[PDB]
Amino acid sequence: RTDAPVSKASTVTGFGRGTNDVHLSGMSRISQAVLPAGTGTDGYVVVDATIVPDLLPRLGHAARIFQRYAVETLEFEIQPMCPANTGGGYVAGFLPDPTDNDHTFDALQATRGAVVAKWWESRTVRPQYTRTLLWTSSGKEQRLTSPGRLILLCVGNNTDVVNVSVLCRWSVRLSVPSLENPEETTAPIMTQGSLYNDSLSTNDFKSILLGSTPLDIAPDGAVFQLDRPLSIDYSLGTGDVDRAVYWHLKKFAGNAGTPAGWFRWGIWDNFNKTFTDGVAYYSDEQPRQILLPVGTVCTRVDSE
Amino acid sequence: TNDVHLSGMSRISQAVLPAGTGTDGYVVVDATIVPDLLPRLGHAARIFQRYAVETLEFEIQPMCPANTGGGYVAGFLPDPTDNDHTFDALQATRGAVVAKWWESRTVRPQYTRTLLWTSSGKEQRLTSPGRLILLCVGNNTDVVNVSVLCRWSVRLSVPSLENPEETTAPIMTQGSLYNDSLSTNDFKSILLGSTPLDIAPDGAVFQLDRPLSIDYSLGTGDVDRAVYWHLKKFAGNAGTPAGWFRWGIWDNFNKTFTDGVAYYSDEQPRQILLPVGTVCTRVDSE
Amino acid sequence: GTNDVHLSGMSRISQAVLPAGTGTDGYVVVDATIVPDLLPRLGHAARIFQRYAVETLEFEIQPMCPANTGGGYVAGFLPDPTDNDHTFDALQATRGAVVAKWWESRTVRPQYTRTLLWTSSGKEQRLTSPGRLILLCVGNNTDVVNVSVLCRWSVRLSVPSLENPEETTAPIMTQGSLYNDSLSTNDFKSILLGSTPLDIAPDGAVFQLDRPLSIDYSLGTGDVDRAVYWHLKKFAGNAGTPAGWFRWGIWDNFNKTFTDGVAYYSDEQPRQILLPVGTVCTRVDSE
Amino acid sequence: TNDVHLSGMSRISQAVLPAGTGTDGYVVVDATIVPDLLPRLGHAARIFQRYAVETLEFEIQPMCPANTGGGYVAGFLPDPTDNDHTFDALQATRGAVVAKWWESRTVRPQYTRTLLWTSSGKEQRLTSPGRLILLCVGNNTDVVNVSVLCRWSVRLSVPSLENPEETTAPIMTQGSLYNDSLSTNDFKSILLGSTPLDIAPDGAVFQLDRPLSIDYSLGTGDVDRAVYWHLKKFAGNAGTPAGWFRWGIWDNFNKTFTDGVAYYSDEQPRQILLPVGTVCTRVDSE
Amino acid sequence: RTDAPVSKASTVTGFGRGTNDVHLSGMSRISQAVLPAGTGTDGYVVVDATIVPDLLPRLGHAARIFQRYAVETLEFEIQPMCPANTGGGYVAGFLPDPTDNDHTFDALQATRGAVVAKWWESRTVRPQYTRTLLWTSSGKEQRLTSPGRLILLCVGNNTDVVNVSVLCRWSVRLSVPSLENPEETTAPIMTQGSLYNDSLSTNDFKSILLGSTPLDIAPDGAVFQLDRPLSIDYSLGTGDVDRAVYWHLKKFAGNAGTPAGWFRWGIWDNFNKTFTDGVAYYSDEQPRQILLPVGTVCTRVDSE
Ligand SMILES: [Ca+2]
Ligand SMILES: [Ca+2]
Ligand SMILES: [Ca+2]
Ligand SMILES: [Ca+2]
Ligand SMILES: [Ca+2]
């Protein structure tokens, strides 16, 4: 027998008490190449993979529930498929800085774990990694969301086709409970090639021009966004030179003739999840202009 | 007891992937596990309605020269409903293996181990414990003639006589058929995105669970609409390895196909005819 | 007695009358798909709980006819409710299956797998039904046979619920291909589909389809349009055609009434199949 | 054993007593306990002939604002025969409760606990363990929407199939119908003094166990006498909340009502037509 | 220190917890007769008393507070007062069915306890009774409110006046708490005589005609009610034969010439507790009619 109050009190009891930790692990292919005979000249950077939960598929999804993760174990296996008579060599190693962009044989052998071997032999690379707790959501500084990157370079010239596959065996512990939308969980990518407005087409441009191993082997229909604005020279149609400013790209698949592919600029309407295309570039007697400089960061924005 | 245990080893399937064909990802066997597919069990199942799986292993068995230098990944996906052939999907399963094309390997899956039906039905999680997919991981140098073997033991439960056209696994489309992809009388099998359909022999007949609408004309500038529920596979060759499908009428009594009406395209609006996830049972006897 | 009850009863499944000389080897006299509703005392309990599991099944044939009739039958319980093969051999394969003269009652005592089932029907039917009893002829019946089939059952009901009287009746798979050659402008024959549940369904009945019924039509002007209907309604057969006939149209659902909405055009078209083997016809009408 | 135990919780009934209506004594639910009234048990009873009560509790459940300041008394009277709705009668029973309209309470009655029939019969002490009455104790300030719940467990004994029109509780009149209270074609339900009749929906049909005599005329100054056994409820509204009854003919096969002859009053002596204690079963399907 | 609510709660504590059982007993006269010499022919049913709390006066009142009662002990004493030289015989016995209406010596001696004796001897009848729980409120079935009835029949012809008195010694237990109005606690009575509309008067009729031992020795001014309607043939006054329907009677006391008495029909207005009288019966050339058949149940409705 209790009295009738003005207002009863809340009885929302089990709230804010969600599962906290998860150890989780597996083995994931982290890339695959095929090199035809001539290709594979000394030093050709066959692979360059920045490690982030997203790259390890199974992990990537669990990471969308917690805010931190910390690496408990990593190794990579190399496992090219090729017969004994192939006389080319590779060198792999895990770079513990995710920002480091200089890929030389000399800079790998320097890394702990690094391996060197003819194409017909498998190898295991038992690397050195942070074992501290990084973040699952991408951020401004990369040093905080990734423990480093795994690169593999040719060492001689392959006599024949090389079918390399590079597997990462991981185990990791996810630390903090939270809900992170799949847009922010993507890894940022730095270009290593200048984009000139002399090297253009009316509505697209080459992906090899940017000189980035990820953007080269990036998938179709894939909408990106940039930190730096893109300057498109358009016209009213009186011989008039006007200026347009777009922030977003769109990947189109490549060819056997054009290894890397295209990139159509435009507008990524996020409120409605769609992608408009960018205005006709005006070819003109306009001074040479770098529209996007070396080091432009491109972060994937569409639904994954 | 009334229950019957049975065990054996049997070839689940055999593909030949010829020289140079095939590239990382290329699905070289996609087999939905049901007793019909397992030869000796095939006949035992025609007798009862219900089976339950006691043991399952697949032994991969590829045949090529030692210098072949391609590669494959194999594995067993427990969801006969899950339709995702990517390597990443495979590498996520238990049992999964990877090797060079000259190496046999044994995939040791985990599976339902529960009581399932022999004849197909709407929900195919009660007809099958899962499906095995084997993919390419590189480009194969040589002809490889892979023969995947399955060692199996099962428990068969209630006696029955089973219609053999019913025992077969339903195949699902992976790609949409658009109206603008039809030729006058046929279309390319590859459009449907399904390896089991692509490799179904010449003259296989399939019923669809969704209507195939064919716009036609009398030849007066007048567009009319027809409906069809059956397809006939016309075998693929070197020029068109997926082969072709003709729509038409399957007569279930006489067991005969009659080709349907010609497609007439006349300034029609964009249309989806057979959306992805269209189900295609084998109705013709084997 | 909060959640589980055992119920036992026996109950008529179905009655059939064979006119004299009707029926022949393999004539399907009764195809009854089992569901709690079809068995009368049980159907009331299955409305109370939403899960049930079968513990004993037994059917008694009891055909009534003169001692001289001299045709025959064969009956059995076929545990897959999905199984549409109604051949003699396939029936005789069923455990407990019996074959006898039209003037001999028999009892079929089968085995069933005794799974937990649902009371309210859903998409997969092997979760709502333990199977279907079939009875078919094995010679020509000389006399009229008025066959009643009984079912003795004991069952375990499990999860307390209260179901609505509309969802409980199990849908029907069509057995035969409906060609457009067979159409008449107002209606079509029931025997063409070949489903004995359809062939027997009482008139004023309404059945929704899972596949679209594509009706050709024209207001006039020598002009062929194309129309769509999801429903069917049963119009009773007469001694000349016992099958009955089906008339398409519109089943207004708020209405609680049928509207024929049937227009057809008979013309030189290429032969088509409108409703193929396997079409699922759910009973939607008022109850 | 052949006996079946069954237990549940179910709403016995739900009244809305609107703002200001209702005064100390006003009967707001009067429900004779039989399995039909208890929803889930309703169906179980249609199967057997006999039930016996194992447990019974009512939980009262009134819904209004906290400031409602009326009141009610509830209880369970063990005599389905006893026809006395007074507070004093209620306060005499075991279980009886009193509260403000915003307070739920639980009445814990004492009941027969013996073996009873499912279908109605002459002596209704064998069809029911009693009846629950809930009354007003003050004037209610606000609209209250009271929903009285019953938690019950029972034992059902012999299997049977039961006619659902037979399962229903007979209603007894509380007030006499006098001849001088008839209108030309109808009379006011309130005259009969029965809450269950007063709240029976529009179009309910009732059979009487006593004849309703209607004096009529041909229009010649000649008085004649007719007899009727059926009433039809015509729904009550704000102006006449009890509604009205028309006498007539119920056709039991076609399940249709035909209104009877007009009443003609012509210097007739005072008469009792339907004495108090006239029994009125629901014959129309529900 | 408690806060002020919107509404305090009910404090109606001791409710619904009334006294439950009562054993209670006594000895009550259940009837009395006086038989003048000639009367008392073999088999004359001198007494016929249906046992119900009401008949036992003290008990009758307690019974209005509980719903059930169950009999714990019964005996009857017979105790005629008469001198040794009276040469007649009686036979008593308790019929355990309250509905049984055939009173023969042969049907008593059959009953357990039954006694037979010359008028000048007392007797005790130790009967057989239900000992189950009946109901205090009358109902449709009598088998449920009464354990049976005590009848006493003459056995020879009394030479002299016979003053018999028949006492019932009882003990009973009252089971269920409730409040039962004195109108429903009365016992129903079945007639054993047809009422013809040829055997009538303008406003009343004989009580012996009904042929019921209770209704015969029923008291004055005593308003009854029937299950079956009564058909009174009245007139508008043009020689017109109209039809009237009354449900209620009224007892008027009897005579030395008319042992049983009268019964005036009418209207028992219960809302106001009064009794109107019924219309002038129209004597007419009307076909012979049974107005109330054998077995009509008459239940007392006025205040007791
Ligand atoms: Ca985060
Ligand atoms: Ca089967
Ligand atoms: Ca359900
Ligand atoms: Ca009954
Ligand atoms: Ca009582």
Coordinates of C-alpha atoms in Angstrom, one line a residue, chain B:
Chain B
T1 CA 15.6 -49.4 -34.2
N2 CA 14.0 -48.2 -37.4
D3 CA 16.9 -45.8 -38.2
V4 CA 19.6 -46.7 -40.6
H5 CA 23.2 -45.6 -40.5
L6 CA 25.2 -45.4 -43.7
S7 CA 28.7 -44.2 -44.5
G8 CA 30.9 -43.9 -47.5
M9 CA 33.2 -41.8 -49.6
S10 CA 32.0 -40.4 -52.8
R11 CA 33.0 -37.8 -55.4
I12 CA 30.9 -34.6 -54.8
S13 CA 32.0 -33.1 -58.1
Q14 CA 34.7 -32.8 -60.7
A15 CA 35.7 -29.6 -62.6
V16 CA 38.3 -29.1 -65.2
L17 CA 39.6 -25.6 -65.4
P18 CA 41.6 -25.3 -68.5
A19 CA 44.9 -23.7 -69.2
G20 CA 44.9 -20.0 -68.5
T21 CA 41.2 -19.6 -67.8
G22 CA 40.6 -18.6 -64.2
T23 CA 41.8 -15.8 -62.0
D24 CA 41.7 -15.0 -58.3
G25 CA 38.1 -15.4 -57.3
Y26 CA 36.9 -17.7 -60.1
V27 CA 34.5 -20.1 -58.5
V28 CA 35.5 -23.6 -59.8
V29 CA 33.1 -25.6 -57.7
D30 CA 30.0 -24.5 -55.7
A31 CA 28.1 -27.4 -54.5
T32 CA 25.1 -27.3 -52.2
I33 CA 25.3 -30.4 -50.0
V34 CA 22.3 -32.7 -50.3
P35 CA 22.2 -36.4 -50.6
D36 CA 21.5 -36.5 -54.3
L37 CA 24.9 -35.0 -54.9
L38 CA 26.6 -37.8 -52.9
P39 CA 26.4 -40.8 -55.2
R40 CA 25.9 -43.8 -53.0
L41 CA 23.9 -41.8 -50.5
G42 CA 21.8 -40.6 -53.4
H43 CA 20.1 -43.8 -53.6
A44 CA 19.7 -44.4 -49.9
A45 CA 18.0 -41.0 -49.5
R46 CA 15.4 -41.9 -52.2
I47 CA 14.0 -44.3 -49.6
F48 CA 13.6 -42.2 -46.6
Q49 CA 12.3 -38.6 -46.0
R50 CA 14.8 -37.6 -43.4
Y51 CA 18.5 -37.7 -43.0
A52 CA 20.9 -36.4 -40.4
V53 CA 24.7 -35.9 -40.9
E54 CA 27.0 -37.8 -38.6
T55 CA 30.4 -37.0 -40.3
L56 CA 31.6 -34.9 -43.2
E57 CA 35.0 -34.2 -44.6
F58 CA 36.0 -33.1 -48.0
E59 CA 39.2 -34.3 -49.5
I60 CA 40.2 -32.0 -52.4
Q61 CA 42.3 -34.1 -55.0
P62 CA 43.5 -31.8 -57.8
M63 CA 45.3 -33.2 -60.8
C64 CA 48.0 -31.4 -62.7
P65 CA 51.7 -31.3 -63.2
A66 CA 53.9 -30.4 -60.4
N67 CA 54.9 -27.1 -62.1
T68 CA 51.4 -25.7 -62.2
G69 CA 51.9 -22.8 -59.8
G70 CA 48.4 -21.6 -59.4
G71 CA 46.4 -22.0 -56.2
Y72 CA 43.0 -22.5 -54.6
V73 CA 41.1 -21.9 -51.5
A74 CA 38.4 -24.3 -50.3
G75 CA 36.0 -24.4 -47.5
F76 CA 32.5 -25.3 -46.3
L77 CA 29.9 -22.7 -45.6
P78 CA 27.2 -23.9 -43.1
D79 CA 24.4 -21.8 -44.5
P80 CA 22.8 -23.3 -47.6
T81 CA 21.0 -19.9 -47.6
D82 CA 24.3 -17.8 -47.7
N83 CA 25.1 -16.9 -51.2
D84 CA 28.5 -15.2 -50.9
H85 CA 31.4 -16.9 -52.7
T86 CA 34.2 -14.4 -51.9
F87 CA 37.5 -15.6 -50.5
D88 CA 37.0 -13.5 -47.4
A89 CA 33.7 -15.4 -46.7
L90 CA 35.5 -18.7 -47.2
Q91 CA 38.5 -17.9 -45.1
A92 CA 36.1 -17.0 -42.3
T93 CA 34.8 -20.6 -42.1
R94 CA 36.2 -23.5 -40.1
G95 CA 37.9 -26.1 -42.0
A96 CA 39.1 -23.7 -44.7
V97 CA 42.2 -24.5 -46.6
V98 CA 44.6 -23.0 -49.2
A99 CA 47.1 -24.8 -51.4
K100 CA 48.9 -24.9 -54.7
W101 CA 47.0 -26.6 -57.5
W102 CA 49.2 -29.7 -57.2
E103 CA 48.4 -30.3 -53.5
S104 CA 45.5 -32.2 -52.1
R105 CA 44.1 -31.0 -48.8
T106 CA 41.3 -32.0 -46.5
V107 CA 38.6 -29.5 -45.3
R108 CA 37.1 -30.3 -42.0
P109 CA 34.0 -28.3 -41.7
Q110 CA 31.5 -27.7 -38.9
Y111 CA 28.0 -28.6 -39.8
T112 CA 24.5 -28.8 -38.5
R113 CA 24.4 -32.4 -37.3
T114 CA 20.7 -32.3 -36.9
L115 CA 17.7 -33.9 -38.5
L116 CA 17.1 -32.8 -42.2
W117 CA 14.8 -33.7 -45.1
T118 CA 15.8 -35.6 -48.3
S119 CA 13.3 -33.9 -50.7
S120 CA 13.6 -30.1 -51.3
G121 CA 11.3 -27.6 -49.6
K122 CA 10.7 -23.8 -49.2
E123 CA 13.3 -23.2 -46.4
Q124 CA 16.4 -25.0 -47.5
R125 CA 18.0 -24.8 -44.1
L126 CA 16.1 -28.1 -43.5
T127 CA 17.2 -29.8 -46.6
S128 CA 21.0 -29.0 -46.3
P129 CA 23.9 -28.6 -43.8
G130 CA 25.7 -26.1 -46.0
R131 CA 27.7 -25.9 -49.3
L132 CA 31.2 -26.3 -50.3
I133 CA 33.0 -23.7 -52.5
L134 CA 36.4 -23.9 -54.0
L135 CA 37.9 -20.9 -55.7
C136 CA 41.0 -19.9 -57.6
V137 CA 43.6 -17.9 -55.7
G138 CA 45.9 -17.3 -58.6
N139 CA 46.0 -17.8 -62.3
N140 CA 46.4 -21.4 -63.2
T141 CA 49.3 -22.1 -65.6
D142 CA 48.0 -25.5 -66.7
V143 CA 45.0 -27.5 -67.2
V144 CA 43.8 -28.7 -63.7
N145 CA 41.2 -31.4 -63.4
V146 CA 40.1 -31.1 -59.8
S147 CA 38.0 -33.9 -58.3
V148 CA 36.6 -33.1 -54.9
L149 CA 35.8 -36.2 -52.7
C150 CA 33.6 -36.3 -49.7
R151 CA 33.8 -38.8 -46.9
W152 CA 30.4 -38.9 -45.2
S153 CA 28.3 -40.8 -42.8
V154 CA 24.7 -40.2 -42.1
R155 CA 21.6 -41.5 -40.4
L156 CA 18.5 -42.0 -42.4
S157 CA 15.2 -42.1 -40.5
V158 CA 11.7 -42.7 -42.0
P159 CA 11.2 -45.0 -44.9
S160 CA 9.8 -43.4 -48.0
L161 CA 9.8 -43.5 -51.8
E162 CA 11.1 -40.3 -53.2
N163 CA 10.5 -38.5 -56.5
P164 CA 14.0 -38.0 -58.0
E165 CA 13.2 -34.7 -59.6
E166 CA 12.3 -33.4 -56.2
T167 CA 15.6 -34.5 -54.5
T168 CA 17.7 -31.9 -56.4
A169 CA 19.1 -28.7 -54.9
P170 CA 17.4 -25.4 -55.9
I171 CA 19.8 -23.0 -57.6
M172 CA 19.7 -19.2 -56.9
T173 CA 20.4 -16.4 -59.2
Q174 CA 23.3 -14.1 -58.3
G175 CA 22.7 -11.5 -61.0
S176 CA 19.6 -9.7 -62.2
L177 CA 18.2 -10.3 -65.7
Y178 CA 17.4 -6.9 -67.3
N179 CA 14.9 -6.7 -70.2
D180 CA 17.5 -5.0 -72.4
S181 CA 19.8 -8.1 -72.0
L182 CA 17.4 -10.4 -73.9
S183 CA 18.2 -11.4 -77.5
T184 CA 15.2 -12.2 -79.7
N185 CA 14.9 -15.8 -78.5
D186 CA 17.4 -16.3 -75.7
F187 CA 19.9 -14.8 -73.3
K188 CA 23.3 -15.6 -72.0
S189 CA 23.5 -17.8 -68.9
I190 CA 26.4 -15.8 -67.5
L191 CA 23.9 -12.9 -66.8
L192 CA 22.4 -14.9 -63.9
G193 CA 25.7 -15.1 -62.2
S194 CA 25.3 -18.8 -61.1
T195 CA 28.1 -21.4 -61.5
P196 CA 25.8 -24.3 -61.0
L197 CA 23.5 -23.0 -63.8
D198 CA 26.5 -22.2 -66.0
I199 CA 27.8 -25.8 -65.8
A200 CA 24.4 -27.5 -65.9
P201 CA 24.4 -29.7 -69.0
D202 CA 22.9 -29.1 -72.3
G203 CA 19.2 -29.6 -72.2
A204 CA 18.6 -29.1 -68.5
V205 CA 15.1 -27.7 -67.8
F206 CA 14.5 -25.3 -64.9
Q207 CA 11.3 -23.9 -63.3
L208 CA 11.4 -20.5 -61.8
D209 CA 9.7 -19.3 -58.7
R210 CA 9.3 -15.9 -60.3
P211 CA 7.6 -15.1 -63.7
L212 CA 9.7 -14.3 -66.7
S213 CA 7.7 -11.6 -68.6
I214 CA 8.3 -11.5 -72.4
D215 CA 7.1 -8.5 -74.4
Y216 CA 6.2 -9.5 -77.9
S217 CA 4.5 -8.2 -81.0
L218 CA 2.1 -9.5 -83.6
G219 CA 3.9 -7.5 -86.2
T220 CA 1.4 -4.5 -86.2
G221 CA 3.5 -2.1 -84.1
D222 CA 1.4 -3.5 -81.1
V223 CA 3.3 -4.5 -78.0
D224 CA 1.8 -7.4 -75.9
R225 CA 3.0 -9.3 -72.8
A226 CA 3.5 -13.0 -72.3
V227 CA 4.6 -15.0 -69.2
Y228 CA 6.9 -18.0 -68.9
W229 CA 8.1 -20.1 -66.0
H230 CA 10.6 -22.5 -67.6
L231 CA 14.1 -22.2 -69.0
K232 CA 16.1 -24.7 -71.1
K233 CA 19.9 -24.7 -71.0
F234 CA 21.7 -24.7 -74.4
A235 CA 25.3 -25.8 -73.9
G236 CA 28.2 -23.5 -73.7
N237 CA 31.2 -23.7 -75.9
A238 CA 34.6 -22.0 -76.2
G239 CA 33.1 -18.8 -77.6
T240 CA 30.4 -18.6 -75.0
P241 CA 31.4 -20.8 -72.1
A242 CA 28.3 -20.0 -69.9
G243 CA 25.9 -21.1 -72.7
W244 CA 22.4 -19.8 -73.2
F245 CA 18.9 -20.1 -71.9
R246 CA 15.6 -20.2 -73.9
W247 CA 12.3 -19.4 -72.2
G248 CA 9.3 -21.5 -72.9
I249 CA 6.8 -24.1 -71.7
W250 CA 7.7 -27.3 -69.9
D251 CA 5.0 -30.0 -70.3
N252 CA 5.3 -32.0 -67.1
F253 CA 3.4 -35.1 -68.3
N254 CA 5.2 -35.5 -71.6
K255 CA 8.5 -34.1 -70.2
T256 CA 9.0 -31.8 -73.3
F257 CA 10.0 -28.2 -73.8
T258 CA 8.4 -25.8 -76.3
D259 CA 10.3 -22.5 -77.0
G260 CA 8.4 -19.4 -76.2
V261 CA 7.5 -16.2 -78.1
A262 CA 10.2 -13.9 -79.5
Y263 CA 11.1 -10.8 -77.5
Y264 CA 10.2 -7.5 -79.2
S265 CA 11.8 -4.4 -77.7
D266 CA 10.0 -1.2 -78.7
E267 CA 10.9 1.9 -76.6
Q268 CA 10.2 0.2 -73.3
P269 CA 11.1 1.7 -69.9
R270 CA 14.0 0.1 -68.0
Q271 CA 12.8 -3.1 -66.2
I272 CA 13.9 -5.8 -63.8
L273 CA 12.6 -9.2 -65.0
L274 CA 14.3 -11.7 -62.7
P275 CA 15.7 -10.0 -59.6
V276 CA 18.7 -11.5 -57.8
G277 CA 17.6 -14.3 -55.5
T278 CA 15.3 -15.9 -58.2
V279 CA 15.1 -19.6 -57.4
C280 CA 15.6 -22.2 -60.2
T281 CA 14.8 -25.9 -59.5
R282 CA 15.7 -28.7 -61.8
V283 CA 12.4 -30.3 -62.9
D284 CA 13.5 -32.4 -65.9
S285 CA 14.6 -35.9 -65.0
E286 CA 18.3 -36.5 -65.0

